[PDB]
Amino acid sequence: KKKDDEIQDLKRKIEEMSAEFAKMLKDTLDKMQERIEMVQWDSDTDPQMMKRLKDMTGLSNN
Amino acid sequence: KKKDDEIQDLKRKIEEMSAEFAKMLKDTLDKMQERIEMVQWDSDTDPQMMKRLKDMTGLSNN
């Protein structure tokens, strides 16, 4: 019973670490997008380059 | 003994996930730094913005 409980706890904490992995990955992607967009907007570069970055980043929502 | 083996496998998975998390977080940080530096160099803005972007994140080499 002790070892079963330990295995369950290990699985649960593996799931928790994976969840934090994914959540902070999404947060990092969001911050990357925000900084990139703000730099693009503050720069006088063309909306053509705006669309170029938008396409290259692969962020086109389906 | 089977339970001990399962526990050890779970611990190894935990360590592998932690290593992957740290490595790929470093990779994402490097990607963001490279993109910021490239977008900063392409623009003809005064190195004032270079220094401002360097100082804002507090990532000054320690």
UniProtKB/Swiss-Prot annotation, chains A, B:
Signal peptide: none annotated. It is found in: Cytoplasm, Cytoskeleton, Flagellum axoneme. Component of the nexin-dynein regulatory complex (N-DRC), a key regulator of ciliary/flagellar motility which maintains the alignment and integrity of the distal axoneme and regulates microtubule sliding in motile axonemes. Component of the nexin-dynein regulatory complex (N-DRC). Belongs to the DRC12 family. This is Dynein regulatory complex protein 12. It comes from Tetrahymena thermophila (strain SB210). The lineage of its organism: Eukaryota, Sar, Alveolata, Ciliophora, Intramacronucleata.
